[PDB]
Design a protein around this motif. Structure first.
Motif, short mmCIF file in Angstrom:
data_model
loop_
_atom_site.label_atom_id
_atom_site.label_comp_id
_atom_site.label_asym_id
_atom_site.label_seq_id
_atom_site.Cartn_x
_atom_site.Cartn_y
_atom_site.Cartn_z
N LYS B 118 0.83 -1.19 0.00
CA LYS B 118 0.00 0.00 0.00
C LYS B 118 0.88 1.26 0.00
N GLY B 119 1.83 1.27 -0.93
CA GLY B 119 2.76 2.38 -1.07
C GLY B 119 3.96 2.27 -0.14
N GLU B 120 3.86 1.40 0.86
CA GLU B 120 4.93 1.19 1.83
C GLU B 120 5.82 0.01 1.45
N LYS B 121 7.11 0.20 1.66
CA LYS B 121 8.13 -0.78 1.33
C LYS B 121 8.24 -1.93 2.33
N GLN B 122 8.56 -3.11 1.80
CA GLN B 122 8.73 -4.32 2.61
C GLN B 122 10.21 -4.46 2.95
N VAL B 123 11.06 -4.24 1.94
CA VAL B 123 12.52 -4.29 2.07
C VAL B 123 13.01 -3.00 1.38
N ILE B 171 23.44 -2.40 3.78
CA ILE B 171 22.58 -1.64 4.68
C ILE B 171 21.17 -1.57 4.10
N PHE B 172 20.23 -2.15 4.85
CA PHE B 172 18.83 -2.20 4.45
C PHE B 172 17.85 -2.13 5.62
N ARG B 173 16.62 -1.70 5.33
CA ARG B 173 15.58 -1.58 6.35
C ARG B 173 14.39 -2.47 6.05
N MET B 174 13.95 -3.20 7.08
CA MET B 174 12.80 -4.09 7.00
C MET B 174 11.55 -3.32 7.44
N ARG B 175 10.39 -3.75 6.94
CA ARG B 175 9.10 -3.13 7.29
C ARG B 175 8.86 -3.37 8.78
N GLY B 176 8.54 -2.29 9.50
CA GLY B 176 8.29 -2.38 10.93
C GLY B 176 9.42 -1.77 11.74
N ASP B 177 10.61 -1.67 11.13
CA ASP B 177 11.78 -1.09 11.79
C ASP B 177 11.90 0.38 11.41
N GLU B 178 12.28 1.21 12.38
CA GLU B 178 12.44 2.65 12.17
C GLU B 178 13.77 2.98 11.50
N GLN B 179 14.78 2.20 11.84
CA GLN B 179 16.13 2.37 11.31
C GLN B 179 16.61 1.11 10.58
N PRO B 180 17.62 1.24 9.69
CA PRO B 180 18.15 0.08 8.97
C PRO B 180 19.16 -0.74 9.76
N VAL B 181 19.54 -1.89 9.21
CA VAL B 181 20.53 -2.77 9.83
C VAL B 181 21.69 -2.91 8.85
N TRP B 182 22.85 -3.31 9.36
CA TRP B 182 24.02 -3.48 8.50
C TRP B 182 24.76 -4.79 8.71
N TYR B 183 25.38 -5.26 7.63
CA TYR B 183 26.17 -6.48 7.62
C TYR B 183 27.42 -6.27 6.78
N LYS B 220 14.20 1.32 -8.67
CA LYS B 220 12.86 0.74 -8.62
C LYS B 220 12.49 0.10 -9.95
N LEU B 221 12.07 -1.16 -9.89
CA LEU B 221 11.63 -1.88 -11.07
C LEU B 221 10.11 -1.78 -11.09
N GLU B 222 9.56 -1.27 -12.18
CA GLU B 222 8.12 -1.15 -12.28
C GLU B 222 7.65 -2.09 -13.37
N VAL B 223 6.81 -3.05 -12.98
CA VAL B 223 6.25 -4.05 -13.90
C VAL B 223 4.73 -4.11 -13.68
N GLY B 224 3.97 -3.66 -14.68
CA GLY B 224 2.51 -3.66 -14.64
C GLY B 224 1.82 -3.03 -13.44
N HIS B 227 5.27 -1.94 -8.02
CA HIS B 227 6.55 -1.29 -7.75
C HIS B 227 7.53 -2.13 -6.91
N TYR B 228 8.53 -2.71 -7.58
CA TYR B 228 9.58 -3.49 -6.92
C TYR B 228 10.72 -2.52 -6.59
N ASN B 229 10.59 -1.86 -5.44
CA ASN B 229 11.58 -0.89 -4.96
C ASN B 229 12.94 -1.49 -4.65
N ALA B 230 12.95 -2.79 -4.39
CA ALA B 230 14.17 -3.53 -4.08
C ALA B 230 14.34 -4.68 -5.07
N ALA B 231 15.18 -4.44 -6.07
CA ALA B 231 15.47 -5.43 -7.10
C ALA B 231 16.86 -5.18 -7.68
#
Ligand code: HEM
Ligand code: HEM
Ligand SMILES: Nc1nc2c(c(=O)[nH]1)N[C@@H](CNc1ccc(C(=O)N[C@@H](CCC(=O)O)C(=O)O)cc1)CN2
Ligand SMILES: Nc1nc2c(c(=O)[nH]1)N[C@@H](CNc1ccc(C(=O)N[C@@H](CCC(=O)O)C(=O)O)cc1)CN2
Ligand SMILES: N=C(NO)NCCC[C@H](N)C(=O)O
Ligand SMILES: N=C(NO)NCCC[C@H](N)C(=O)O
Lengths: 361, 361
Positions: B118-123, B171-183, B220-224, B227-231
């Protein structure tokens, strides 16, 4: 009807802008009334010596595709609106080559010929450049870009020696004549530069040469609604125009493989970047050769640096900068210049130089 | 309201075009009804394995700024829409680097992560590229283009050794987290290539190196309508990207003067074209080095030649060609390629890859 309306609107815009730059803002009212009376009486108007001199200068300043615009205000404007015969046009064109060449210390010049009166031309120049090489086609002899003009000159009675560097004659049409006339160029008037390299002695075996001054003669100068269809202009060459385009393009002299051969490198692999190394040595050779002969030339890095100072000065003067990125970037090492790393507005601002249809072809 | 309307219109256009290319024109009617029922029930729809695989391929084919588009149909699409945790995303990104690198024989790949609901990112991936060098600023240490991302990684607890080639962490952020994580990236996973020249032994004194695979991870990959913001995607490098931009630009590693010094030429005069000669030797060195290590790379002449075959095949297939001239031309010897001598339509055709706002800065 509509032609007298367009003419008056462009005149109002020009005189106001021109006189504001020249510090004669109070003289606008009296001059615009005289112009209104002249358009109703004749159907056109005649610019003053100060008006077209600054109009040709402003036109250079507005040339989107030009990297050498820093020197806009130093343009030497030659007024030849007094020409009536074919001999007068020939002498004016001979004079332009002589004064612009100036024994190698090239003077940026322009010769203004009589403009179009009722849409019809008074003097019509067929040459792309006043000094240009012929092209023929067996195999390819000469400059391929000059093929159609060469065929048009030949249909008029001209015949070249069929070498790679035949000078095209001056070809122009006077009002009242159905066909154009031609005049061969005196060899003493045309300075040519043999191409040699500073370190590689074998470079002279290629027998490459180019003329010293690029005098574009087929562009229309538009100043305040007045169309100067015949107004040849010149600056000096930027090295890349000769070494990266005229002598390097596949559709021009196509010398890269031959350059690679004399500099001792192989043409086997794309990964060895032989084309790039050939371009660098040909371009280094062009700059050295013109300098050694005392003929004015500029390298692309210095030209770009000069164009940066132009961008600064236009901002300081309060004028908006217009440019064509696709033409402003040098064809060799564009990313090493500032031009590559910024954007330019490609809007057409009048007065300017425009392309016009070729009478031949 | 308007969001469910835009989604259905782009879906109708995509499914029809996609299935027409795959030879499944009769299956359009039944699939479009199922999609209509899914948009009303959930507010989005899920692509099939065949749909996004071809959508990511079509998206590459439509990338105006890409010269390597000839190989569009050979894209290896990895489906990771099943990821839920930060460990799953990390393992998917580690897998992408490994399979795409393929011990040097680079495989053009893309990893598809869960799209926006719903406009919000998962990853949400913060890295510009999965493998990229850090930048700091005393004097300039590292890659200046990575400054803001480096400062964002440091604000999260990461600290680099402050060398010119510190690998940035994932460095990436998961849905539900305010800040990102790093590896931190395992050194065994990242292939790096030391830069040496085939003829000049002294080139190794510059201690230059670059990573093997460019994996753009912030587009961002847009297909039909989805919105695949992470690809993250990757192809292989074109030599000029490293030797004429990354290591040559004044705002990047700025190595031209240092290259000129080791190849034995003077940096005194613009007319000697030292920058151009330095660019040719650095670019020859990059191509040699990657080849010697068995890491896939392409020179600009071969890449342009491959792009010509793409233009031919698109015409043969009946599709209109779109391109961005300003990006398609190589930054070294552009006039030696066909790209320079023609025009391209810069229209945006969907599916495509788009720029999205940076979460940092
Ligand atoms: C001061 C020396 C000058 C230099 C270094 C210079 C350089 C250049 C260069 C490199 C180009 C592109 C050439 C090509 O790719 O074919 C160009 C184009 C152009 N220049 Fe300049 N220029 C100079 C003087 C002039 C002058 C004196 C005028 C006008 C009064 C002028 C008007 C233009 C125009 C209209 C174009 C576009 C030509 C076309 O569209 O084919 N230039 N110039
Ligand atoms: C087969 C190998 C490939 C080569 C030789 C190649 C080469 C290039 C080059 C030289 C650029 C310009 C880079 C720059 O100036 O920063 C570029 C841009 C681009 N490429 Fe390709 N590419 C390849 C594969 C891919 C793949 C696998 C995709 C997509 C699935 C892709 C998508 C794009 C996009 C979207 C851009 C624009 C990036 C931006 O705007 O910053 N490329 N490519
Ligand atoms: N010095 C100089 N630069 C040049 C040429 C030149 O002789 N001299 N000749 C040019 C070769 N031919 C063209 C003609 C038009 C376009 C062109 O139009 N390109 C963009 C225009 C983008 C835009 O500005 O809108 C496009 O749409 O693809 C590109 C190369 C390119 N640059
Ligand atoms: N490979 C590659 N090519 C590039 C860049 C790159 O990183 N990679 N970076 C670019 C440097 N910056 C810009 C950004 C925008 C424009 C630009 O917008 N130019 C035209 C656009 C014309 C047009 O198409 O309408 C103009 O209006 O002046 C030019 C250079 C140029 N080309
Ligand atoms: N340098 C200038 N104007 O001064 N050049 C104009 C165009 C000349 C053309 N490119 C040629 O090589 O002949
Ligand atoms: N060659 C490709 N895609 O495959 N390149 C992408 C952009 C990479 C960027 N120019 C870099 O130098 O890192």
């Amino acid at each position: 009807g509509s032609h007298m309306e367009i003419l008056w609107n462009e005149a109002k815009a020009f005189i106001a802008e021109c006189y504001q730059e020249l510090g004669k803002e109070e003289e606008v009212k009296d001059r615009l009334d005289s112009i209104k009376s002249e358009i109703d009486r004749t159907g056109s108007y005649v610019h003053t010596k100060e008006e077209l001199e600054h109009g040709a200068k402003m036109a250079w300043r507005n040339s989107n595709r030009c990297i050498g615009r820093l020197f806009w205000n130093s343009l030497n404007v030659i007024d030849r609106r007094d020409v009536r015969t074919k001999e007068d046009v020939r002498d004016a064109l001979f004079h332009h080559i002589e004064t612009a060449t100036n024994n190698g210390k090239i003077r940026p010049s322009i010769t203004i010929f009589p403009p179009e009166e009722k849409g019809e031309k008074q003097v019509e120049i067929w040459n792309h450049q006043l000094i240009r090489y012929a092209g023929y086609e067996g195999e390819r002899i000469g400059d391929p870009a000059s093929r159609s003009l060469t065929a048009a000159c030949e249909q008029l009675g001209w015949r070249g020696e069929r070498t790679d560097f035949d000078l095209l004659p001056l070809i122009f049409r006077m009002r009242g004549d159905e066909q154009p006339v031609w005049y061969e160029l005196p060899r003493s008037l045309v300075i040519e530069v043999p191409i040699t390299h500073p370190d590689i002695e074998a470079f002279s075996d290629l027998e490459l040469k180019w003329y010293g001054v690029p005098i574009i003669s087929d562009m229309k100068l538009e100043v305040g609604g007045i169309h100067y269809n015949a107004a040849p202009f010149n600056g000096w060459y930027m090295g890349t125009e000769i070494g990266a385009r005229n002598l390097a393009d596949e559709k021009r002299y196509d010398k890269l493989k031959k350059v690679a051969s004399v500099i001792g490198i192989s043409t086997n692999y794309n990964t060895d970047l032989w084309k790039d190394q050939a371009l660098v040595e040909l371009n280094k050779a062009v700059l050295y050769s013109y300098k050694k002969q005392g003929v004015s030339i500029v390298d692309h890095h210095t030209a770009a640096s000069q164009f940066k100072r132009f961008e600064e000065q236009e901002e300081e003067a309060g004028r908006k900068l217009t440019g064509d990125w696709t033409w402003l970037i040098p064809p060799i090492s564009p990313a090493a210049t500032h031009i590559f790393h910024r954007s330019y507005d490609n809007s057409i601002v009048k007065p300017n130089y425009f392309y016009q249809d070729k009478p031949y072809e």
